[PDB]
Amino acid sequence: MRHYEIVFMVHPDQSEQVPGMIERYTAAITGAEGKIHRLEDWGRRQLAYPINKLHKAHYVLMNVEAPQEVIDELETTFRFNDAVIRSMVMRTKHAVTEA
Amino acid sequence: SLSTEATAKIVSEFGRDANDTGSTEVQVALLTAQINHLQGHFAEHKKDHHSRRGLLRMVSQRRKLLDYLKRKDVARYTQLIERLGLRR
Amino acid sequence: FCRFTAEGVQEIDYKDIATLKNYITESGKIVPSRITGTRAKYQRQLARAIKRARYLSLLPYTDRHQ
Amino acid sequence: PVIKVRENEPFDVALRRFKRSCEKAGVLAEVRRREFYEKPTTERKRAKASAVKRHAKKLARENARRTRLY
Amino acid sequence: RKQVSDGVAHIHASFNNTIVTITDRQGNALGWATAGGSGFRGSRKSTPFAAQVAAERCADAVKEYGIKNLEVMVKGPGPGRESTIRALNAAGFRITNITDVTPIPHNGCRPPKKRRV
Amino acid sequence: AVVKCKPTSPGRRHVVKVVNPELHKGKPFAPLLEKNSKSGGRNNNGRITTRHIGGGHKQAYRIVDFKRNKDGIPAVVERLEYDPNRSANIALVLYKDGERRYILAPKGLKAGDQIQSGVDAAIKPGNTLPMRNIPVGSTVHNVEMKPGKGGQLARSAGTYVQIVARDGAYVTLRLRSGEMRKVEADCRATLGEVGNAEHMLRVLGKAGAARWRGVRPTVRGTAMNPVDHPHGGGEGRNFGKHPVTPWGVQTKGKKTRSNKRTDKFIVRRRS
RNA sequence: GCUUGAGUCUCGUAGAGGGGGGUAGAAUUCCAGGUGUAGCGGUGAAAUGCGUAGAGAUCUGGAGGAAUACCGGUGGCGAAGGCGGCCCCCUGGACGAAGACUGACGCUCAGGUGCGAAAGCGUGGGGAGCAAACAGGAUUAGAUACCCUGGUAGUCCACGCCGUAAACGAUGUCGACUUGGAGGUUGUGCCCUUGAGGCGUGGCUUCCGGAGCUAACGCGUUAAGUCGACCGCCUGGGGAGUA
């Protein structure tokens, strides 16, 4: 079980799709093995540059301690999904608490 | 890279007791486990020369421990090469 | 003086961009440790966090760019 | 870089502040380096030569230029 | 003879020549003037005086358009920019704001080899 | 794995052969075979219409399904087969109901792998999807040019197609020749590239190898008389003429595409 | 037998150490379109070149390839070659703390094996920019050069070969001992963190200097000082690192 921070930006009009998506991925995590520590939804805010002809993406942050398998298939699920414009997964040391 | 789980299971299968960790047959078992794991690693990638230089360092270190163990006491040395699965 | 030695932050994180806005220039370039007095491990961490924040569009690359 | 000249501001003030912006950012030095390819030999030799000049006049500043002439 | 109030001035200054082009804010140009367009050939093309004269000719190139104010973008190094924007209001304008829009690679492409003389 | 052969003969000296050990040694699946008589290049008038064809080994046609119409039902890859009608290997696939079929073999494939076509399936290699469910930048093969047609493009060994753009109903692909072509987004495509990319490195060694591939010798038109070819004639190796086909059409550069109805589908022709 | 050399384990740390896979942004070129028009480019000056078949400028968009501004450092890591966006996967080493454990397991190494910049070679791709060869314009007494405008291999990738460099701190490896100062980088302990502190102790590194050494220049605790172990190498210049 390794700790990973997962930050993605989802589309402006696909901000309405965010919560069940989240639980789907939590069904990917907690249904397989893992544990969600922080799940902090930033919501829509302004990019510094127009990624894909558009500003104002909807940011989601997820800190999660999980094995490598589930996050491999989660990265494959993040890639071919057309709702997210960018995703970033990092291996941190521990799990964190505060915003 | 030989997790502590594996180092403990080696050291309490080859050792005088649990806190004994620097005996030579323990060290030969440790280097054997890491050499086998890296034989896993170099099936792929084929061109990691720096990781190979670390591997060849630990191969030569195991060979010098083995020649010392043969020169010192052959009774546990022949048991070590029968048990640990190597020839020389 | 180095404030990052004062608060003792173990890993600077990109998610706070107020300090990251403080440590870049108005053109968006990272500001050298010669003038901020930042101690060098925090300078490396700070540049790494600034690039990680640029990738996530919490910071610009250049000030101009369309 | 980005300058926005707002209400109640003269002309040459704004022009000098734009020149200050260009000298803060160092855009002309970064264009002047990119006109010709300097080899990595020339880069490292320029770095070392400028550094030895820098500190070799600096330690002369610190103790050699502190004793009187007349 | 189409009218529009405000536009953008682009002063592309190289080391050999300065080109002033006054556009609208949608990028579409209205007319241009160079440091070689009137006289001023060769060594006298690189001087700041040539860039001042280029701004003065692009000032009359938009006499039909009636431009009240314009933001001035500046590109490239060389003896262009400051004399040009100083002559730009001397020919009669209100320069709204100034940008330096010169391209800087992030080590993108290899430059040509250094000259020996 | 390509192997160069030991030079124990000249005809052995210049041979590189490629040997795939994962192929099935034995008789192919007999319900999927039919006979394949040879022509010699002769049409129904009995005359040679394509030169340099004749002879070779007898071979049987393997019915390789190109269409991939069974959707949703998964299928397990049993074994890869040699195919004498193709540049690529084929794969015997076993659907869950019990049907067996022959498909093209993609690059990453093995025994016991699961594949399935359909709109629902996956983005692994071997799965066939219509080209609305495939990301831009992907690598497809066995591309149809009409919906339900079967698959005309990118189906020999090592060959693939990149997806460049999707303009609504149409998908702009980049073919293996460097062309850009628009296809409808309704027609199916299999993911991956076609396997056996080592096919290029065999060098055949000798005249008998080309002779049992079914290829008859090619006489140069300079070596003939002027009644036979426009190049022919001359006392001792004269050419003096522009290079032409045997029927007097200029070769070495002159274009020969006159379709005029399929030009709307072309974006950028081959360079 | 012993623990002092050499190693093993527990805990952390910093790192352009390496291999595989993604991805972002700036820029160059090209293509398509919009505005608009007579110059652009280049130079010491020119011309070749591009341009009224609509360039250069400018904006929207696309496509590619390569390299990763700022940070950036007489900074770091690596045996050396070398390594610079960001993320993930696999993986090597070095260092620090307090302990424990084996108990001389060590040092060096002819032949041997491995790695080894760039250029080059083979096969298969890729090809933006740069660019040997090449062409044209100049300069010139001439100019098969420098300067300009182009431009192919090559540079890039995969897998093999080559095995050389001013591969250089022109300084073999290992160990011992011998005044100081200013720094940098990375651990760590103690005291009141009583305040951006002090007093310590480890590793690596940069400069200046003392004795001593040296032909001198300089080196100087990271020695070219004082010693020990092993290895490689030299014996006037050219012919020749050639036959």
From Swiss-Prot, chain F:
Q: Which residues carry this modification: N6-acetyllysine?
A: 241
* InterPro entries xref list: NA-bd_OB-fold (IPR012340), Rib_uL2_dom2 (IPR014722), Ribosomal_uL2 (IPR002171), Ribosomal_uL2_bac/org-type (IPR005880), Ribosomal_uL2_C (IPR022669), Ribosomal_uL2_CS (IPR022671), Ribosomal_uL2_dom3 (IPR014726), Ribosomal_uL2_RNA-bd_dom (IPR022666)
Instruction: Give the signal sequence positions.
Output: none
Q: Per the record, which residues fall in region Disordered?
A: 27-52, 220-271
Q: Alphabetically, which GO biological process terms does the record hold?
A: cytoplasmic translation; negative regulation of DNA-templated DNA replication initiation; ribosomal large subunit assembly
UniProt cross-references to PROSITE patterns, sorted A to Z: RIBOSOMAL_L2
UniProt-listed SMART domains: Ribosomal_L2 (SM01383), Ribosomal_L2_C (SM01382)
State where composition is biased (Low complexity): 38-47
The protein's UniProt keywords, in alphabetical order, are:
Acetylation, Ribonucleoprotein, Ribosomal protein, RNA-binding, rRNA-binding
Q: Explain what the record says happens when changing residue 229 to Q.
A: Loss of peptidyltransferase activity in reconstituted ribosomes. No change in rRNA binding or assembly into ribosomes
List, alphabetically, the GO terms of the cellular component aspect: cytoplasm; cytosol; cytosolic large ribosomal subunit; DnaA-L2 complex
Which molecular function GO terms apply here?
RNA binding; rRNA binding; structural constituent of ribosome; transferase activity; zinc ion binding
Report the protein's function: One of the primary rRNA binding proteins. Located near the base of the L1 stalk, it is probably also mobile. Required for association of the 30S and 50S subunits to form the 70S ribosome, for tRNA binding and peptide bond formation. It has been suggested to have peptidyltransferase activity; this is highly controversial. In the E.coli 70S ribosome in the initiation state it has been modeled to make several contacts with the 16S rRNA (forming bridge B7b, PubMed:12809609); these contacts are broken in the model with bound EF-G.
The UniProt record's further free-text remark is: This protein can be partially replaced in vivo by its H.marismortui (HmaL2) or human (L8, from the 60S cytoplasmic ribosome) homolog.
Q: Spell out the family assignment given in the record's similarity comment.
A: Belongs to the universal ribosomal protein uL2 family.
Q: Which PANTHER family match?
A: LARGE RIBOSOMAL SUBUNIT PROTEIN UL2M, RIBOSOMAL PROTEIN L2
Q: How does it assemble?
A: Part of the 50S ribosomal subunit. Forms a bridge to the 30S subunit in the 70S ribosome, contacting the 16S rRNA. Interacts weakly with S6 in one of the 3.5 A resolved structures. In pull-down experiments interacts with CedA.
Query: What is the name attached to this protein's record?
Result: Large ribosomal subunit protein uL2
Tell me which species this is from. Escherichia coli (strain K12)
Which gene name does the record give? rplB
